[PDB]
Amino acid sequence: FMVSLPRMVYPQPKVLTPCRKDVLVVTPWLAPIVWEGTFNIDILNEQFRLQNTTIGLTVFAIKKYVAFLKLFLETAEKHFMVGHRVHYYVFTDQPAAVPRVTLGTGRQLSVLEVRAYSMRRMEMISCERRFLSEVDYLVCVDVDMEFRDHVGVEILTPLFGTLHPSFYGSSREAFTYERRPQSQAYIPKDEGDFYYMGAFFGGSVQEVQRLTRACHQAMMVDQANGIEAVWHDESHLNKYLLRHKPTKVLSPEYLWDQQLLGWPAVLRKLRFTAVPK
Amino acid sequence: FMVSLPRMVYPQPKVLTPCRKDVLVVTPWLAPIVWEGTFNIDILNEQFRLQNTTIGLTVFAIKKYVAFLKLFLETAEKHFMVGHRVHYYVFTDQPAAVPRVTLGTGRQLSVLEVRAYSMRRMEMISCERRFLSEVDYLVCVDVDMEFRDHVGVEILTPLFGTLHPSFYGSSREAFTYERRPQSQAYIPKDEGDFYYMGAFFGGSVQEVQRLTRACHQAMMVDQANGIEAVWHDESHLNKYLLRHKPTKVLSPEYLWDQQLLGWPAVLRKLRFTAVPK
Numbered sequence: 001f002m003v004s005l006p007r008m009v010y011p012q013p014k015v016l017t018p019c020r021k022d023v024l025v026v027t028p029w030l031a032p033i034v035w036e037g038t039f040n041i042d043i044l045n046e047q048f049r050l051q052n053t054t055i056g057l058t059v060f061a062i063k064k065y066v067a068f069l070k071l072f073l074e075t076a077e078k079h080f081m082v083g084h085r086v087h088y089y090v091f092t093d094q095p096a097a098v099p100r101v102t103l104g105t106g107r108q109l110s111v112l113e114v115r116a117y118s119m120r121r122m123e124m125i126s127c128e129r130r131f132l133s134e135v136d137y138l139v140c141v142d143v144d145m146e147f148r149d150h151v152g153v154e155i156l157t158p159l160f161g162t163l164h165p166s167f168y169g170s171s172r173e174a175f176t177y178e179r180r181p182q183s184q185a186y187i188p189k190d191e192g193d194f195y196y197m198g199a200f201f202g203g204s205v206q207e208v209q210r211l212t213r214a215c216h217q218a219m220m221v222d223q224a225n226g227i228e229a230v231w232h233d234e235s236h237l238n239k240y241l242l243r244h245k246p247t248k249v250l251s252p253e254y255l256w257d258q259q260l261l262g263w264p265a266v267l268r269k270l271r272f273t274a275v276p277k
Numbered sequence: 278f279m280v281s282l283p284r285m286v287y288p289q290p291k292v293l294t295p296c297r298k299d300v301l302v303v304t305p306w307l308a309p310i311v312w313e314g315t316f317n318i319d320i321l322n323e324q325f326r327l328q329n330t331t332i333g334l335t336v337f338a339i340k341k342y343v344a345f346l347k348l349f350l351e352t353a354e355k356h357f358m359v360g361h362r363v364h365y366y367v368f369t370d371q372p373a374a375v376p377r378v379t380l381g382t383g384r385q386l387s388v389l390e391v392r393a394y395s396m397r398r399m400e401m402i403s404c405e406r407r408f409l410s411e412v413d414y415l416v417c418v419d420v421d422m423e424f425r426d427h428v429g430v431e432i433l434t435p436l437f438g439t440l441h442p443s444f445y446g447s448s449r450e451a452f453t454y455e456r457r458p459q460s461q462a463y464i465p466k467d468e469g470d471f472y473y474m475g476a477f478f479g480g481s482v483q484e485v486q487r488l489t490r491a492c493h494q495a496m497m498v499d500q501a502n503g504i505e506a507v508w509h510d511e512s513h514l515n516k517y518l519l520r521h522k523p524t525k526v527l528s529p530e531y532l533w534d535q536q537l538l539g540w541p542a543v544l545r546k547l548r549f550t551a552v553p554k
């Protein structure tokens with residue numbers, strides 16, 4: 001049950017004035033594509049706070065990648081879901097190397113020890129009972145990253161992927177999907193909506209567990225058949241999101257590499273960006 | 278559980294090419310606004326057929342309005358949810374005046390007798406147990422109308438309203454919301470997203486029952502206080518959808534009066550239109 005919104009004063013949306021005329025803001029299956037200018041964050045914050053929403057953020061920091069945790073977490077504190085309930089889940093082979101980072105109120109961090117050495121992340125996420133009890137949504141991101149700007153409840157939805165920053169302008173034949181019919185991740189050259197990056201996906205706990213289960217099972221079949229998809233779990237993520245359309249798509253504002261790709265006119269904000277390695 | 282979509286060949290959506298540049302296609306709370314060119318109906322039909330979706334359509338034909346049923350139903354057969362399961366619910370004081378209309382396969386019609394003589398429609402819809410058992414979505418429309426073009430699963434969502442054809446270009450101060458603070462339907466001049474028409478709303482059975490219950494209760498409070506909102510149940514519908522944002526908004530393609538308003542450039546299709554009375 002969703003209670004009433006309070007009175008709010010904000011600019012009237014105008015039917016004959018698009019927010020953005022330079023980009024596609026809705027997919028052909030009527031999922032929003034999230035760009036700056038498409039959302040009133042005050043309205044969304046109200047809606048999600050009225051549901052007392054809890055967001056889980058999973059991040060893997062295995063072997064040398066523990067060095068990325070300090071900047072990742074400190075910048076997450078500045079920019080990720082501020083004002084909402086957040087539970088970070090840090091999967092690592094080195095629990096003692098996790099930096100002591102000061103958290104804002106309503107935010108917690110759990111260290112989950114794992115084995116070191118593409119199958120690990122999808123298998124590890126598909127924690128099943130814990131996430132169902134503790135959070136409403138799961139967001140699954142790369143650690144070799146930093147938040148530079150707002151990443152908030154505008155992303156939340158049953159299932160989302162993120163446009164790969166290298167391929168948002170590419171035609172589908174150029175996408176680096178797995179192209180061998182012998183792989184479970186196979187997508188032919190005449191199929192595909194978008195190329196999603198493995199570094200930022202999420203959704204409700206239920207939908208994220210479905211996706212990660214399916215990708216894990218598909219990767220196991222491939223392993224048994226002696227094939228490894230060209231881009232590993234990303235290849236399977238793309239296969240999954242082709243056959244199970246996401247209910248929102250994040251623009252490349254949400255996954256950018258400024259060193260590689262600069263700052264194009266189409267990006268009004270760079271929100272979550274690659275750290276040099 | 279949603280099974281996989283089959284392989285499909287369709288045009289690739291392009292991130293740097295908007296479908297429509299002339300209209301707002303997503304609200305500031307990230308609900309799609311449904312216009313022609315925003316959706317691939319083949320994808321949506323697949324998604325909704327894979328869930329074996331059943332759509333209930335409610336229509337009231339009381340007193341002289343029974344005369345509108347023949348054209349309403351015959352044109353619904355040509356254009357409304359064709360290929361999907363449909364259950365029409367015709368509420369009338371004259372069961373014997375309901376025309377015998379031939380239905381396509383998978384479609385059924387129930388005649389529900391009611392009393393003759395704004396409270397009736399919201400009260401009557403909030404049938405509660407029957408709809409929950411028989412349909413997935415409810416669509417609630419005026420009878421003095423005809424379908425001229427496709428109205429399909431693109432509209433389905435937990436909660437939707439439709440932009441009133443007279444007001445989609447209007448600023449909010451000009452909207453004919455109820456303006457007296459003594460009414461439950463009161464909306465001040467600095468609030469409001471859109472002006473929704475009472476003639477086409479819907480959603481999941483649960484959300485439609487919530488809306489109709491709330492509007493019925495609000496109208497009862499008004500009656501007890503000796504006030505009747507300026508546009509009756511439409512005034513309350515607008516209050517409800519202000520405080521409970523719809524998850525899709527239908528463009529005026531879905532509710533048009535060609536005699537009054539012609540055929541503006543912004544409408545690529547006229548789907549569901551007023552019959553002269």
Ligand SMILES: O=c1ccn([C@@H]2O[C@H](COP(=O)(O)OP(=O)(O)O[C@H]3O[C@H](CO)[C@H](O)[C@H](O)[C@H]3O)[C@@H](O)[C@H]2O)c(=O)[nH]1
Pocket residue numbers: 059060061062063064065066118141142143144197198199230231232233234235
């Ligand atoms: O030694 C490692 C390697 C990786 N990671 C974790 O795995 C994440 C992903 O690894 P990278 O950042 O090195 O790789 P990309 O994000 O470039 O991932 C893409 O390239 C990969 C192969 O390099 C796979 O194909 C993957 O599916 C695809 O999304 C890292 O952020 C980190 O969280 C570790 O913790 N330790």
Ligand SMILES: O=c1ccn([C@@H]2O[C@H](COP(=O)(O)OP(=O)(O)O[C@H]3O[C@H](CO)[C@H](O)[C@H](O)[C@H]3O)[C@@H](O)[C@H]2O)c(=O)[nH]1
Pocket residue numbers: 336337338339340341342343395418419420421474475476507508509510511512
């Ligand atoms: O004698 C009647 C009158 C109305 N109706 C039913 O009620 C529907 C709505 O009535 P109208 O078509 O006459 O009115 P509008 O659609 O123009 O409705 C708008 O104007 C109404 C007052 O005229 C209310 O304010 C209502 O909330 C607002 O949406 C009709 O389609 C019909 O289904 C009947 O069956 N018999």
Ligand SMILES: CCCCCCCCO[C@@H]1O[C@H](CO)[C@H](O)C[C@H]1O[C@@H]1O[C@@H](C)[C@@H](O)[C@@H](O)[C@@H]1O
Pocket residue numbers: 164165166176197198231234256257260274
């Ligand atoms: C010559 C150097 C490597 C830089 C060129 C990489 C450009 C394409 O990005 C890569 O795309 C792959 C799928 O085709 C896969 O997702 C890995 C991805 O590379 C990662 O993401 C990029 C945006 C960069 O941050 C890159 O460094 C990172 O490895």
Ligand SMILES: CCCCCCCCO[C@@H]1O[C@H](CO)[C@H](O)C[C@H]1O[C@@H]1O[C@@H](C)[C@@H](O)[C@@H](O)[C@@H]1O
Pocket residue numbers: 441442443453474475508511533534537551
């Ligand atoms: C002088 C004649 C009446 C025609 C002028 C009506 C224009 C405005 O439409 C009316 O708007 C009201 C809210 O302000 C309320 O929704 C009723 C609505 O009138 C109905 O819908 C219109 C689009 C027409 O189909 C109209 O005939 C119908 O009554």
Ligand SMILES: [Mn+2]
Pocket residue numbers: 142143144199
């Ligand atoms: Mn990375």
Ligand SMILES: [Mn+2]
Pocket residue numbers: 419420421476
């Ligand atoms: Mn009418």
